[PDB]
Symmetry: D2
């Protein structure tokens, strides 16, 4: 007995009513979702935080039956950094409760308030982290991480940013294997990165979540980068028994 | 460059935050979308009026390119009347300005305010109409209508209500033919009906539209019927559909 | 446990190896599947017979579990008759056993051998009949028909031929309702026909069936028309414990 | 103006005529496609090679229009080895011309006849390689690799085999960026591997190609492992795929 919800934005459009935008999020004339503040020149600013949600909650689990949804989302994104040596803070795909407020900037990625684990967050996220928060146990490498009610990622893998180049991303969740899987590929320069782990979405998330993007820039001048999104598809399936 | 927005409600849930319940519209505990009001008794009430819309506007055409969405939807619904001789007024699947407010009850079907045509409605519907308003040029028989900016359907055809029986609808809009088609089947009765006509969606809708059901029961006590929706499926693409593949399992 | 097989021919190409063509059927330069003989000049010929099948069998029902496929097919076809008053014989979408040869021409539609019902035809069809075979209890009008192990339709509805316009067809089988529905629209005329009936696929087909088209022109001189298909899409779904 | 062709085998079934079996490929009565010979015990035999292709050719590209197909494919497979430390040879998913004979075994994986690259193979493969063949430039570790007309990969990455555990694979081709990607995840060990390269196909493969799997065991006793496939979906679009939807509908 399956519900499904899916959409594909191959462009973005100014003021799109199917998209909830938060903090600094703009969608440009040219169709770019500009998650984080970027002046006329292309020049990203500090002290920024931006978010994008799909306008309707996704039913990721069902308490009557205990059935859990599988989902798959795909997106393409570009991090340009004026200076690659100083980069902060990163972007992320997440699933948080609905009407849940944006949270601290920088390392927090606009999804947390603190280094502390808290089951209250009810956030699961795949981060693309570009600055090392030693305070958070970040690997020293810029990384893909999987967060579960904590910015202190449960598992991380290296990810070598290709500055200004477009990354194609696939994020997967098999509900019967409880497997969350994230893969990033640079089409131009042909590199590849994968991270996978087990997350039991029912003990973590509410039945209904907002899905979308979060992004932050550095708390320090020069520690700046864009977080531009070009396209985004998603598809979730919630079957009620076998 | 193709956008797609799409979904399946095969079962409904109370309070479902991805739909916008308006008027009396609710979803019971066992999953039925009651568009229009029903006592626990199971007795349908008069002067009810309810709508359900998907909470996400749909991009139906793009002004910059001129490009227009194709779309498909299907659902399963029952109208049950305690008294088949006194049945009012109907239900409808529609597109309208985001997220439109319900308009007059009764034979207006929550979609219109009078018998006259008006472009500001910006509304296009397929009605499944159950009471003959002669001031709306209604045919004597129960009928499926296509309606554009008016309650006076621009084309109707016969529909024989099977009282208390689930009908399966496929409504369909091929953008290159500007073709709207509504098919209705009762699998229990083996009976079927189709209406087909053109409507140039770009002429009559805004770029963004809210999609849903609308239903009303009668303006006099006893003209009464349910307008229950069991399941619902929708799919659109806008390029700046694969229908076979869409039904066989949406 | 759901298997699925699906495709779309948005146009045909000559000797494309995923169709098997039988009889006179061929694919033209401009990508048309002419089921029946049309000459040099567009003049269709009599005594012609053509079938075009998907080169893969379709698992219609599973005997071990007794479950049965749902499937949906859509196609676009033109028949054009140079004399509207003298047209024959029709076309058909059908399911039948594999390596099951073409069968009698004319009014049997490449699908049968006599008037009589016969179980061992193991054939199910939706037909688009342009000539009254009185001998087959044909209605006195061009009709659409459901046929199950007989050219004697188990049900019909009136179909109004629109000479030389493309017809859009949607045929659909719902194995939970055991419900076969055929709809035909002409975009040009705005016209619309539907036929709906119960058919037990599990009763009348084997587990695997070829799926395709059959068509035939009239017997006598003059009872001629074309039977041209432009596009075809099929999808089926066979869940073992649904 | 877009063609399509997809399927999903969640089970395999004995004899299944939409699947063409070559060499030793057997489908177990419990549903496993056994690419290479697996005896009574369940003990894999050496000296084996098997292949299973989809029974109909796939249109990968069109010469008239020069347009080229995109495609996803996923599958579950298990390699079981009685001694983890004597293992050969490997399995692959390939695209070769119809109706390609199966070719040399062992480290050639049933796809190639020798170390030599050849254009007239018109074979592209994603390889799962379990034995180092120095004659083919194999890296010291077990690896996934992209093969184009040759048993010598154009690129590889360390694949660490988890013995007896189902691997889930995703293979994609983006014709728009001539880019082929293989990824494998062992859901039990939460462990993963991904491999990206550019390969044209228009220049390398015919318009029509058969597709499936190929496998082989070692050339000497004891160098043995199974190559068992549990499910398989495939999707191809060629305009003259929405992967996110593909995966979650398998
Ligand atoms: C529904 O479908 C089946 C087809 O599967 C028909 O049954 C078959 O009919 C054929 C043709 O009549 C029979 O073949 C016969 O088999 C015997 C040996 O078993 C042959 O020798 C025989 O030939 C003799 O007759 C010939 C013509 O008279 C000569 O040329 C030969 O010399 C030879 O002397 C012929 O090939 C099948 O055996 C029969 N199959 C089965 C499984 O029964 C149905 O036909 C009906 O039933 C038949 C028994 C027969 O009596 C027909 O007259 C019936 O139509 C067919 N049913 C209907 C209603 O059409
Ligand atoms: C579409 O619906 C709109 C809004 O309902 C119609 O506009 C209304 O039309 C009436 C004209 O018959 C107007 O009557 C007036 O009432 C006011 C006081 O409230 C008086 O001061 C005035 O003397 C009129 O009698 C009404 O004003 C008007 N409402 C609004 C909000 O403008 C509309 O009718 C069409 O446009 C309007 C503005 C007039 O020009 C009409 O003549 C015209 O037909 C509806 N359109 C159609 C095509 O039916
Ligand atoms: C790469 O792949 C091509 C195509 O298979 C190879 O060419 C083929 O080689 C075969 C010999 O190994 C040729 O077949 C023989 O033809 C003669 C003449 O009738 C027969 O008497 C004999 O018994 C064989 O059937 C085959 O003709 C040829 N195929 C084609 C399509 O031309 C190719 O091998 C190289 O080219 C040929 C001309 C011979 O010189 C070979 O020795 C040769 O290596 C393969 N390339 C390599 C480097 O291995
Ligand atoms: C978690 O969050 C809530 C409010 O958001 C707070 O009351 C609580 O103290 C939190 N921290 C921990 C460690 O539980
Ligand atoms: Ca960090
Ligand atoms: Ca009415
Ligand atoms: Ca006839
Ligand atoms: Ca090797
Ligand atoms: Mn981190
Ligand atoms: Mn009406
Ligand atoms: Mn007939
Ligand atoms: Mn290798």
């Amino acid at each position: 007995t399956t519900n499904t919800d899916s959409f594909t934005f191959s462009k973005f459009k100014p003021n799109q009513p199917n998209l909830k935008k938060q903090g600094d999020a703009t969608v440009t004339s040219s169709g770019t979702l500009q998650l984080t503040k970027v002046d006329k020149n292309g020049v990203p600013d500090p002290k920024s935080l931006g978010r994008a949600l799909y306008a309707s909650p996704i039913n990721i689990w069902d308490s009557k039956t205990g059935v859990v949804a599988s989902f798959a989302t795909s997106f393409r994104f570009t991090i340009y950094a004026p200076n690659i040596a100083t980069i902060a803070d990163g972007l992320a795909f997440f699933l948080a409760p609905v009407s849940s407020p944006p949270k601290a900037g920088a390392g927090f990625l606009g999804l947390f308030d603190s280094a502390v684990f808290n089951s209250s967050y009810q956030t699961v996220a795949v981060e693309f982290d570009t600055y090392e928060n030693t305070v958070f146990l970040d690997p020293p490498d810029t990384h893909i991480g999987i967060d579960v009610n904590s910015i202190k990622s449960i598992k991380t893998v290296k990810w070598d940013l290709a500055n200004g180049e477009a990354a194609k991303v696939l994020i997967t969740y098999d509900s019967s294997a409880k497997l969350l899987v994230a893969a990033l590929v640079y089409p131009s320069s042909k590199t590849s990165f994968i991270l996978s782990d087990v997350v039991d979405l029912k003990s973590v998330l509410p039945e209904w979540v907002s899905i979308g993007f979060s992004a932050a820039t550095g708390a320090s001048s020069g520690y700046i980068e864009t977080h531009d999104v070009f396209s985004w598809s998603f598809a979730s399936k919630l079957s009620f028994a076998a």
